[PDB]
Amino acid sequence: EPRFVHLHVHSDYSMIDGLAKTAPLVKKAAALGMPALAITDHTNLCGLVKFYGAGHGAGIKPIVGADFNVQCDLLGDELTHLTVLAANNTGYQNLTLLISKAYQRGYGAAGPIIDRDWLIELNEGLILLSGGRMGDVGRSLLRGNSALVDECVAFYEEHFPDRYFLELIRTGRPDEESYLHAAVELAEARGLPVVATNDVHFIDSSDFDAHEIRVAIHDGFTLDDPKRPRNYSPQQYMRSEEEMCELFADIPEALANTVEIAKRCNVTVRLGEYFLPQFPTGDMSTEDYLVKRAKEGLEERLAFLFPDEEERLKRRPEYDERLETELQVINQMGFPGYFLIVMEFIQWSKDNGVPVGPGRGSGAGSLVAYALKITDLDPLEFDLLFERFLNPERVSMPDFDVDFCMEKRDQVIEHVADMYGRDAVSQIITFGTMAAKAVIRDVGRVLGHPYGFVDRISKLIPPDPGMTLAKAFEAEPQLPEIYEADEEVKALIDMARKLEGVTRNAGKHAGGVVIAPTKITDFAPLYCDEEGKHPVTQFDKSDVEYAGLVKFDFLGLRTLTIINWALEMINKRRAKNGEPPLDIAAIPLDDKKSFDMLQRSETTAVFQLESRGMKDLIKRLQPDCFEDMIALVALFRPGPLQSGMVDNFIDRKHGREEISYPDVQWQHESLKPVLEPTYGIILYQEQVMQIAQVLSGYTLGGADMLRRAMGKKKPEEMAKQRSVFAEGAEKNGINAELAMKIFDLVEKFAGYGFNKSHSAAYALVSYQTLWLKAHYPAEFMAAVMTADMDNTEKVVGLVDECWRMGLKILPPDINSGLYHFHVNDDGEIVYGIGAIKGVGEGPIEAIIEARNKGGYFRELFDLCARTDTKKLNRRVLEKLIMSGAFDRLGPHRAALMNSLGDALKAADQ
Ligand SMILES: [Zn+2]
Ligand SMILES: [Zn+2]
């Protein structure tokens, strides 16, 4: 049984200090043979979820807490320290509110702050550590003011009677032992308990210098600056029980209370299971409302899939069943709410202006998702599996990985705030980390080096994303050279290896939106800027999800927004000619116009397929169906080619080899529908499941369990299932001895297998673009160019590509020009004026209001003299003059520039 437990500890999430990350701290506490650990960061619970995930895995009990800067009228302007532990969940939601109250209140340079009297209402379930020499009671003792001491203790004697402990710390800092003595006395005289703490900020004592620089970078000081605050001692590392016991041997009850307190603290953070909000229904069980909509959804989907042409009545069965099997699993696991929430949201986005990304996770395998128009692929057709997305044989959180554009966030939030409540909705925090370049940069400044000396090392660091220091040393031979040649450079880099990855701040921008069933502060604390605005959950995208809140991420995918513009343009065309608006989901997936094109390798602007190596793969492959469109992203990899698996796929398809299920030597003829569209090769994860379904007789639930069993790659569990495969073979009935011979291959073929529900989701959008480029190239290309206005080169290039595919693209004309590119009545592309760098949407809107205010622009003068000046700057006019927008009307550019002076004289009169 334990002698001591650390109740005051900081991680990098404190941001103003801390060095080690959450999990490592957990692992050190573990190695030290300790029962529990309390990470108490500065005014946040940012790593709380990670903390729990780690304590679970390491067999350590997490203790929730946080340090606070405090102010009470009693000490005036001066701030004091206070550590607050959550004994139970009543106190953990109080601690959350405190943190949220500090930030929501706004702050200045001292950071967020709490009023000690806030501890009056936010009280139950909390255990306070005095703060030590820096606490309100602590300072008074050193100041020697007895009345003050009595008056502070009177607050804790009243509001935290058995929950206030005098914190004793021996880190060899000024006025420590002095306070300790004074505190110990007060303790004995007032009957107050003490407790020992090491005020930990780093793991090993030798991490002290790395921490000092970590702080300095934040404090904006140079390391050797005399006026640089020196607030930490090397003793503030994570000490052992022994070290801590010998250290406080003269006051055991201080050590004993760490163990008592640790016992009194037990907070529950339920991870891995949703807390869904309530979907509008009326009088109907959320379960019931799902089926009414799912069935109505399947009605439409079936009418379309199988037109009145009542062949549907012969294939309708296979669907009605699937819907039920799913709908039952969904309703048993308490997820109908989720499916509805996403359904409705996706609908709202279609009606309003919001485009949502292609990512549906594994959801494309849900026939219910199909019915609710959450996914637009029919999973029956393409053997997309429901129990790969949501398997009742395991615990999981159904995620459609739905994301929208960060630009349209305020619009999205407004809608979910209407649907589920204003303070029920919130944005998600994002953290800044010191990457290789930036850490070299900042450690350089702190060690007193000019930006020139340092940038010479930062420039060696490759720009590749996810680049680490260790990789830079591998790729760039100059680094180890200069590292061993210069003692200063090597001290710089040694230190930057220690700080690499550390967290410096919050965004910047949020990661997305989250929706709680009640006010957000019930599930997470808030973070705010200096003025208590721009609130976000202190948990980030991953953590907030695991805490069991429904989230929607942001993304900068320009592909989906392009397709909107195309259809917009395309449908305006439909408006004049009196024909039905186009539903992009209703397009045929078998279209030779599109596929003949695909094979020509004309994929520029075709989402995903438009790289270089892909176009080589395409030529070599020659896909004629949507099936091998899905296979495309799965074949384009180092794994498949390194094994020749791709060279096989193409060879079979094209007759250079005869199909086999899967192998020439080992195979069976009952895998017909399973390995047919893949031409016999084991490509997708769903196929690994399906062979085990028909060959063995797995229930797809167990098939899914096996798929993962292989990924765990520990024989025990594989041997368990192995036998399950052999007897499974003979029951439904086949030849064994091959079930074992094919198994050890699918064992390996599942290795580089690919999630099909994920591929088809994206592949659909690739095809949707390929199609638009084939049947409406003008509208689509115009849309693509509207998406690239900000980049001139891309525009020029796209113009070439237009002319090459036989499109007529007209240069900037001030009379017909719009902000976005568009298509004229004759099917020609009109240059979007927004493409002219330095003009902007403002002036362009003005130019149009002017033009719609008559006809207009018989010449430059007619524009200048017309359009409101300063809505249209003279410099904005040069940009226009120089784009050749007036080339039709008056004289040409050079001659017009000279005339500009005059036209603006006349302009105002
Ligand atoms: Zn600190
Ligand atoms: Zn602290």
Numbering used by the authors: 3 to 911
Sentences from the paper on this structure:
The DNA polymerases at the core of every bacterial replisome belong to the C-family of DNA polymerases. All members of this family contain a set of four domains that are organised within a single polypeptide in the following order: Polymerase and Histidinol Phosphatase (PHP), Palm, Thumb and Fingers. The PHP domain in Pol III and Pol C is a barrel-shaped domain located at the side of the polymerase, near the Thumb domain. In E. coli DNA polymerase III, however, the PHP domain has lost several metal-coordinating residues and is likely to be catalytically inactive.
For this, we made three variants of E. coli Pol III with three, four or five mutations in the PHP domain, termed 3mPHP, 4mPHP, and 5mPHP, respectively. The first of these mutants, 3mPHP, has three histidine residues restored at positions 1, 4 and 9 (i.e. R10H, F44H, R203H). We crystallized 3mPHP under similar conditions to the wild-type protein, and the structure was determined by molecular replacement and refined to 2.9 Å resolution. The 3mPHP structure is virtually identical to that of the wild-type protein, with a root square mean deviation of 0.92 Å over 756 aligned Cα atoms. Two strong peaks (5.0 σ and 6.1 σ) that stand out in the anomalous difference map calculated using X-rays of 1.000 Å wavelength, indicate the presence of two metals bound to the active site of the PHP domain, even though no metals were added to the crystallisation conditions. The two metal ions in the 3mPHP structure were, therefore, modelled as zinc. Likewise, the mutants 3mPHP and 4mPHP do not show increased 3′-5′ exonuclease activity relatively to the wild-type protein in the presence of any of the metals tested (Zn2+, Ni2+, Mn2+, Co2+, Cu2+; Figure 5 and data not shown), which may be explained by the fact that these mutants do not have all 5 missing residues restored. Here too, we find that the protein apparently unfolds in a single step, with the 3mPHP mutant being less stable than the wild-type protein.
